[PDB]
Amino acid sequence: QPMIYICGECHTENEIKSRDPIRCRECGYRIMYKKRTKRLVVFDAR
Amino acid sequence: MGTKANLVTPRNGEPLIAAIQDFLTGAYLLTLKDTFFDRAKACQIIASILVGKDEKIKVRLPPPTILKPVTLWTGKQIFSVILRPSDDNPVRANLRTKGLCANDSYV
Amino acid sequence: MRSRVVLGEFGVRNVHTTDFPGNYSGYDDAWDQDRFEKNFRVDVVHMDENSLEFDMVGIDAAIANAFRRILLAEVPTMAVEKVLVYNNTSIVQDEILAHRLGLIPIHADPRLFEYRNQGDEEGTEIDTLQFRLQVRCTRNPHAAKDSSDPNELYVNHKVYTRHMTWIPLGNQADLFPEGTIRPVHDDILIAQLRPGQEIDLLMHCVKGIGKDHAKFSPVATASYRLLPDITLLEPVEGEAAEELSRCFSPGVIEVQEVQGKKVARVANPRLDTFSREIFRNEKLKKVVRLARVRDHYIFSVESTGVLPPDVLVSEAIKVLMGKCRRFLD
Amino acid sequence: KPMVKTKTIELIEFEKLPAGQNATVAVMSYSGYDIEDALVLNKASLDRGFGRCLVYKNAKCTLKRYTNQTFDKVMGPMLDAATRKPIWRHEILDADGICSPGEKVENKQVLVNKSMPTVTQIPLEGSNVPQQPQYKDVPITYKGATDSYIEKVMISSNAEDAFLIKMLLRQTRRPEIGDKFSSRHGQKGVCGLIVPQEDMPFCDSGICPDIIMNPHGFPSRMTVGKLIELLAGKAGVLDGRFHYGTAFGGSKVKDVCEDLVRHGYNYLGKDYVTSGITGEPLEAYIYFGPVYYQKLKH
Amino acid sequence: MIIPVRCFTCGKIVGNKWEAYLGLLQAEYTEGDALDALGLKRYCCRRMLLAHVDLIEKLLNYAP
Amino acid sequence: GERKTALEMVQAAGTDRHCVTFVLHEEDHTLGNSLRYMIMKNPEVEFCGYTTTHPSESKINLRIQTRGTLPAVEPFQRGLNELMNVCQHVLDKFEASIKD
């Protein structure tokens, strides 16, 4: 249900679930970079 | 093997513990006949015998070893400073020549 | 002798401030005000926007270095200590950007806040000047002049410290934020951005002291000179003036006459950052004598925008008051 | 960039990609920690960013496939109990248990898990029931005693669906007492102390060291290729130049000395420092100028 | 990768001074004199600009 | 208010107040040597003695050691009050010079 699948070769998102290997829309491009998330990570600024 | 192992070896008969480096030259420079100090330079004294754990007795303030127009503390008995459990010692034959030859030997 | 330092070709003599009662058989000043508030004075030099300079006259080294060390990192100022994260899409990230921002000087007076004990957001009541940073970059949409500079195809291709919009906590809204809340500099390259990236943050501007993490220093130039007083002995009047005006720094020694040969003695013996070639003419060095004097510990403080340097030096000299009388009961 | 460079540093092209910070430096003996090639590196320059690190590492969740039974569909923790949704087992993964691009995953949390049914069905006519209720889950968790930050997540899958999970576990371990330095002269000291800004000596202008060496690595190693690099640093910046000392050529000591003269220093580039600790001039002058300290691994 | 906002051993602020040299290297002073019209009168910040490699541009050339 | 700071240490006090090591907590060279200065500047003290013994600079064991008769609280406070007067008179002469 999420869309966390960017492709450094197809700037578009699928998250086609399991038993569908990777293929970025219309291509192989099996090089998914996965999006970051929305938690308010805290950094000591030192 | 904590207090007798360190300083005395049977393989050589020579100490292993020693001023590795700059302690050698820092202490040397102290000993140099030039260096004249201040009673205000009782500061550096006090990391030694007025100092960290297990040394805070007094120190007998080696006397004012000049009384000129300008009182001053020579550099040696600023090295030779401790004032708990008085002791006695002797030495000689440092690394220099012989004869009062700008003396850096027979301490 | 007694506060005339000497600068031999090999090493500096006369340097310990050897005037304490009972360390000189002249007389030593059981020291305070009457002999000390008469000799003391604070000249001023050039005063200006972020750089200040002045010449205290009559201190000795300990209190002067106490100032120096307090101005550097024993005086508090407003600077970020934490960075909340919202959609940090950008390039290198999360600890440099965190610390980049950690290094940006915010411009709120550090005398209308207090320290921060463990509170709600670690604390959210008085201290948290909270800064919002919402920078978006995209494609400048009218660039028929295709394949041009980044400055012309992008939009806010960089993240300057002018996008640091301030967020109000109902506490502050009426006292400071009329315009005296922005960071000092509206131009700092925090992180370049290329189409499709954004940044969004929250910037917890805690109090702090310089010892903690020196990003709390207000000052840059807290280190100084004594003051040189370069002498002359039966001078080298004539054409030697060329030598004793290129050895010393370019304004230091005048060159006045030729008939009245007059290698023109000292003109400005404070402009010389001691290049000291003069021991290598080998025929002059035995005329000049170099002497930085122990009275005038010439200061020159410069800030980082957080406060005017006068405010910083006054704050330091009063924090020494605080320290000295916090152990005096 | 290097700042006393060699005509062969350019030809490599790897002076567009320099490997070490370019550090202000004194030659100074602080107090018994410097001694056998050790370095009193001041803080307030570690603080201002002298010598970060960005140690990455790599976890590869080689998500196999098997002939009869299948890893194929079986991805996804997130039991989602009450405490840490569910627990420091599966606290920080994600909706799909795979990724977490930016969260300080800590000390043996889960970076990725997978129920691991590999051969729980016997390939022959064995047990019938193991049609994937027999997962002995095999977590992929490990880490060291500090927070990483998952920075990239990769589903890199070759033509066989043998799912990798490549991951950028970045750990910005900025220096501390013990870290490794080199010098460009086989002079590999270590951070003895880490002094604060206010205690380091300041010349007269306002410059206080980043690094400190003590002049005890030289006279018995005889790297005199370092008492000179600090001449063509401080003469190349004080003038804007960008100097060369190249093998069997270079730039001699005389022109550099005259450059230091022109912008106000010694022939020898030996500054006239006062001491922070007490506040009055060092008795013997103090070498300075830029070095190029590399920051090693290990 | 990016410009140190502070001269690691000085204190002075720096990051404000890289989009002036790329406009003062084309008024075409000598680098040693593009870094005198902006304030840097010490070792430190002269290092922190003369020595730095703006990998920002070349890296961002292919960021996505 | 110096209850958890000035941990004096006369235990085997040769003179009644001899080994008087004000272990000034949370302290650096800054006050340390300025105090050390003013203390050392009285013709009844023999050590100003300031030496931070720890690696971390928080406990400056100023080991003032007077000439035997006095306590050492008396100089300690003379010096602290003298530094009070000195720094306040410095500020008085200073901020009235910003009008230049």
Side-chain angles (χ1 to χ4, degrees), chain A, chain B residues 1-47 52 56 58-82 85 90 93 99-107, chain C, chain D, chain E, chain F:
Chain A
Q1 289 181 355
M3 294 298 103
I4 302 169
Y5 291 178
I6 322 176
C7 307
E9 305 165 356
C10 188
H11 278 117
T12 303
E13 303 105 302
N14 291 319
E15 285 209 7
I16 310 164
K17 298 288 95 176
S18 315
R19 314 281 300 308
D20 311 285
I22 282 294
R23 285 185 178 91
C24 299
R25 204 166 312 150
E26 295 95 10
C27 301
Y29 293 170
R30 313 190 187 165
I31 304 103
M32 319 294 200
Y33 307 87
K34 287 185 74 165
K35 311 180 167 182
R36 86 290 177 276
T37 56
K38 279 76 68 178
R39 268 70 55 78
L40 295 203
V41 172
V42 184
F43 293 109
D44 202 22
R46 307 173 42 140
Chain B
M1 66 182 180
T3 191
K4 300 288 94 176
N6 295 256
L7 299 77
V8 289
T9 315
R11 283 191 220 70
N12 291 61
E14 62 98 22
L16 321 173
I17 301 194
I20 188 65
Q21 294 209 4
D22 58 357
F23 316 111
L24 299 147
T25 182
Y28 169 58
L29 261 183
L30 271 169
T31 70
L32 276 196
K33 204 177 231 194
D34 293 290
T35 63
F36 270 115
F37 269 114
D38 313 326
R39 167 172 73 124
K41 304 292 106 166
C43 201
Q44 43 85 24
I45 301 299
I46 286 189
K56 295 183 289 294
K58 50 172 210 173
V59 71
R60 285 169 176 84
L61 189 64
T65 181
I66 289 171
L67 305 166
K68 283 182 182 294
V70 287
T71 66
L72 280 192
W73 265 250
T74 70
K76 283 180 219 323
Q77 79 276 19
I78 304 315
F79 165 87
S80 79
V81 65
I82 195 76
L100 291 156
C101 65
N103 293 291
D104 211 314
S105 179
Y106 82 106
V107 286
Chain C
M1 183 184 320
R2 269 168 79 189
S3 82
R4 278 72 173 175
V5 177
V6 174
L7 286 163
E9 65 183 1
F10 280 128
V12 187
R13 293 312 176 276
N14 290 284
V15 55
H16 289 324
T17 71
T18 67
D19 271 340
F20 291 156
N23 194 345
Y24 210 94
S25 87
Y27 155 70
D28 270 1
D29 269 336
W31 282 92
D32 265 3
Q33 307 290 156
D34 49 344
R35 291 84 57 195
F36 163 97
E37 191 76 338
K38 173 57 144 293
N39 297 341
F40 205 96
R41 52 165 196 272
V42 169
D43 302 327
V44 181
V45 174
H46 182 74
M47 281 146 278
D48 267 324
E49 181 164 2
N50 285 45
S51 186
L52 199 152
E53 170 145 0
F54 59 101
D55 207 13
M56 306 212 176
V57 185
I59 319 170
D60 302 70
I63 309 152
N65 194 7
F67 299 172
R68 293 162 181 153
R69 302 183 44 105
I70 286 159
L71 276 167
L72 292 173
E74 312 203 1
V75 161
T77 51
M78 282 325 317
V80 177
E81 192 74 28
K82 194 168 305 174
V83 187
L84 280 177
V85 170
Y86 302 87
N87 180 0
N88 304 7
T89 313
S90 175
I91 205 67
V92 191
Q93 175 73 260
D94 269 323
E95 288 95 334
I96 65 149
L97 186 153
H99 177 292
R100 296 275 97 186
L101 281 70
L103 273 181
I104 310 169
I106 295 89
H107 181 193
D109 200 312
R111 311 164 287 170
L112 283 72
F113 294 80
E114 190 52 19
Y115 281 74
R116 169 79 65 82
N117 289 311
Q118 280 69 240
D120 306 325
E121 209 158 5
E122 152 69 17
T124 312
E125 278 83 335
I126 309 298
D127 293 348
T128 290
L129 293 166
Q130 197 172 8
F131 273 107
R132 181 53 69 88
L133 194 165
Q134 51 279 42
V135 190
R136 52 202 70 61
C137 73
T138 177
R139 308 167 150 198
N140 203 59
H142 316 323
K145 53 204 76 61
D146 280 335
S147 67
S148 307
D149 273 328
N151 293 351
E152 268 69 29
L153 192 143
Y154 303 148
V155 171
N156 275 315
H157 49 274
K158 305 207 196 196
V159 176
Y160 288 95
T161 78
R162 69 172 161 261
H163 298 329
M164 293 176 70
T165 293
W166 194 72
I167 285 179
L169 316 188
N171 210 17
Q172 294 83 18
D174 55 358
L175 167 53
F176 284 166
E178 56 265 5
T180 174
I181 45 163
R182 78 291 185 278
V184 180
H185 306 287
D186 282 336
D187 42 0
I188 281 175
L189 190 151
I190 292 312
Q192 291 204 3
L193 302 173
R194 306 268 165 256
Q197 315 191 333
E198 272 88 340
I199 287 177
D200 282 310
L201 290 190
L202 272 183
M203 213 179 304
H204 278 297
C205 302
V206 193
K207 290 293 294 295
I209 175 175
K211 306 181 61 67
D212 207 319
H213 165 289
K215 73 173 155 37
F216 285 134
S217 65
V219 171
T221 61
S223 306
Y224 320 101
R225 315 190 268 178
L226 273 289
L227 180 149
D229 177 88
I230 49 174
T231 61
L232 290 172
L233 271 193
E234 293 167 24
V236 286
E237 294 151 354
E239 63 87 22
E242 276 151 349
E243 316 190 339
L244 301 198
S245 161
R246 304 152 301 91
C247 307
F248 292 150
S249 291
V252 176
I253 300 316
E254 280 181 350
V255 288
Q256 262 170 15
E257 272 194 348
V258 285
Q259 166 266 298
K261 306 178 291 295
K262 293 178 178 66
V263 56
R265 80 288 181 275
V266 298
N268 206 324
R270 60 179 290 170
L271 306 182
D272 53 90
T273 72
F274 279 162
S275 182
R276 289 176 68 188
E277 293 83 3
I278 186 50
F279 312 78
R280 309 212 211 180
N281 294 297
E282 315 206 333
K283 193 253 193 184
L284 279 166
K285 78 206 284 168
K286 319 180 221 176
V287 168
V288 190
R289 185 156 71 74
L290 304 193
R292 56 167 89 168
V293 169
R294 272 181 203 155
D295 293 13
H296 302 218
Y297 290 69
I298 190 167
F299 274 75
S300 89
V301 187
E302 89 192 0
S303 177
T304 60
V306 160
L307 290 170
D310 266 340
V311 178
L312 293 183
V313 59
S314 279
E315 183 76 7
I317 185 179
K318 278 316 285 193
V319 163
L320 198 42
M321 311 285 308
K323 257 172 168 169
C324 72
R325 75 180 171 274
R326 181 71 275 171
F327 284 57
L328 187 54
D329 300 311
Chain D
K1 267 161 191 173
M3 167 97 75
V4 181
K5 63 188 290 184
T6 58
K7 288 188 231 196
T8 181
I9 290 172
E10 307 190 353
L11 273 163
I12 305 166
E13 286 144 344
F14 304 169
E15 191 252 351
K16 314 194 153 315
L17 302 177
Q21 295 265 333
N22 195 85
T24 298
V25 163
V27 173
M28 189 89 184
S29 59
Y30 277 179
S31 87
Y33 318 92
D34 293 328
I35 318 187
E36 177 50 6
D37 263 345
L39 301 166
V40 176
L41 190 159
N42 74 277
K43 77 185 280 218
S45 308
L46 294 173
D47 305 87
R48 305 207 194 68
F50 180 82
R52 284 195 192 274
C53 313
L54 297 200
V55 193
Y56 284 47
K57 273 161 171 131
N58 179 21
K60 311 166 272 185
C61 176
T62 71
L63 191 157
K64 278 74 176 175
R65 294 183 336 123
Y66 198 67
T67 77
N68 300 97
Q69 206 173 357
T70 61
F71 306 95
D72 287 309
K73 272 201 179 293
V74 188
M75 186 65 204
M78 295 299 102
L79 298 173
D80 289 331
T83 74
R84 308 284 174 217
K85 290 151 162 196
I87 175 66
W88 286 41
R89 309 277 58 62
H90 325 270
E91 161 193 297
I92 301 299
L93 292 177
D94 203 354
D96 218 338
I98 297 169
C99 56
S100 301
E103 284 95 357
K104 50 176 80 167
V105 170
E106 179 183 348
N107 298 335
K108 290 81 67 176
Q109 281 167 25
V110 169
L111 297 162
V112 74
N113 283 8
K114 47 189 194 318
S115 299
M116 187 67 203
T118 314
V119 184
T120 53
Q121 290 182 175
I122 310 296
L124 61 94
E125 302 79 354
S127 43
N128 266 319
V129 296
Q131 63 268 14
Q132 283 192 0
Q134 290 205 326
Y135 312 113
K136 169 48 170 181
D137 309 342
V138 165
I140 320 298
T141 62
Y142 274 90
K143 271 181 190 308
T146 300
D147 295 338
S148 88
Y149 286 95
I150 283 184
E151 195 77 23
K152 191 196 292 292
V153 172
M154 272 315 268
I155 310 145
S156 298
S157 175
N158 64 60
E160 297 172 353
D161 201 81
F163 274 10
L164 279 176
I165 286 300
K166 288 183 140 312
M167 172 96 78
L168 282 192
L169 305 153
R170 53 165 294 247
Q171 314 179 8
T172 185
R173 318 199 180 146
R174 312 175 84 232
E176 71 273 14
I177 298 91
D179 169 58
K180 272 175 171 112
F181 277 174
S182 163
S183 158
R184 285 301 178 74
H185 294 333
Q187 190 145 51
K188 45 186 88 83
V190 164
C191 318
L193 268 171
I194 294 172
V195 169
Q197 174 64 75
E198 60 251 29
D199 317 312
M200 290 266 177
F202 57 82
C203 298
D204 283 317
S205 75
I207 322 302
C208 77
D210 291 331
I211 307 300
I212 293 173
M213 311 215 88
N214 50 355
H216 294 106
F218 313 144
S220 76
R221 285 169 195 73
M222 301 167 320
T223 78
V224 192
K226 197 173 190 66
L227 316 187
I228 297 170
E229 163 159 41
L230 274 73
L231 282 190
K234 152 168 65 161
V237 293
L238 273 181
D239 295 332
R241 289 286 90 199
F242 199 71
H243 276 300
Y244 295 81
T246 295
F248 319 114
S251 288
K252 279 55 188 161
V253 176
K254 300 174 179 159
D255 61 357
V256 175
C257 287
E258 170 55 57
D259 270 316
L260 306 182
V261 173
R262 182 169 60 251
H263 275 88
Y265 285 113
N266 278 274
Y267 291 169
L268 286 172
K270 289 165 78 82
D271 291 292
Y272 294 167
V273 176
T274 62
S275 62
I277 292 171
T278 182
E280 71 270 20
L282 274 296
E283 189 147 6
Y285 315 104
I286 296 313
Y287 204 52
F288 270 89
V291 188
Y292 182 87
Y293 280 98
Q294 306 218 313
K295 294 188 50 49
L296 304 161
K297 74 171 295 190
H298 275 297
Chain E
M1 181 177 129
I2 318 172
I3 308 89
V5 183
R6 303 205 164 216
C7 278
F8 296 93
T9 181
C10 197
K12 194 174 278 287
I13 318 299
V14 171
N16 58 1
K17 293 142 171 180
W18 259 90
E19 296 303 327
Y21 304 91
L22 276 56
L24 265 59
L25 291 188
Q26 305 186 6
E28 277 184 308
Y29 318 98
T30 48
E31 290 218 42
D33 289 308
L35 276 76
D36 291 331
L38 270 170
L40 314 188
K41 280 161 202 307
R42 297 144 149 178
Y43 300 107
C44 302
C45 307
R46 300 232 177 94
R47 296 87 189 291
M48 312 299 135
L49 290 82
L50 290 169
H52 264 288
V53 307
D54 303 351
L55 290 173
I56 61 171
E57 317 176 355
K58 306 143 199 195
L59 277 158
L60 295 173
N61 193 348
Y62 48 82
Chain F
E2 300 86 1
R3 287 290 86 85
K4 292 293 289 184
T5 59
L7 300 189
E8 303 203 35
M9 293 177 71
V10 294
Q11 315 282 59
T15 77
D16 180 59
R17 294 330 300 271
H18 200 80
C19 61
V20 193
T21 69
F22 311 136
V23 181
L24 300 177
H25 291 349
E26 271 72 8
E27 198 67 27
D28 291 331
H29 297 277
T30 66
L31 178 45
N33 196 304
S34 304
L35 194 41
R36 178 270 175 194
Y37 178 58
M38 299 316 308
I39 297 174
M40 193 47 247
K41 293 176 72 68
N42 275 324
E44 291 86 4
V45 181
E46 280 170 28
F47 288 168
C48 48
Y50 157 75
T51 81
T52 81
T53 192
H54 295 105
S56 87
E57 267 164 357
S58 289
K59 318 206 178 275
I60 65 150
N61 307 334
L62 185 150
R63 183 177 176 88
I64 178 172
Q65 300 200 168
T66 184
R67 282 190 173 168
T69 76
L70 298 175
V73 171
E74 302 308 331
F76 192 37
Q77 286 188 25
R78 283 177 193 167
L80 274 180
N81 261 308
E82 277 145 355
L83 180 82
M84 280 271 285
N85 297 318
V86 164
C87 286
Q88 199 171 13
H89 273 98
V90 168
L91 184 145
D92 284 340
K93 299 192 68 85
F94 159 69
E95 288 179 354
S97 304
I98 296 307
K99 307 306 180 273
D100 303 339

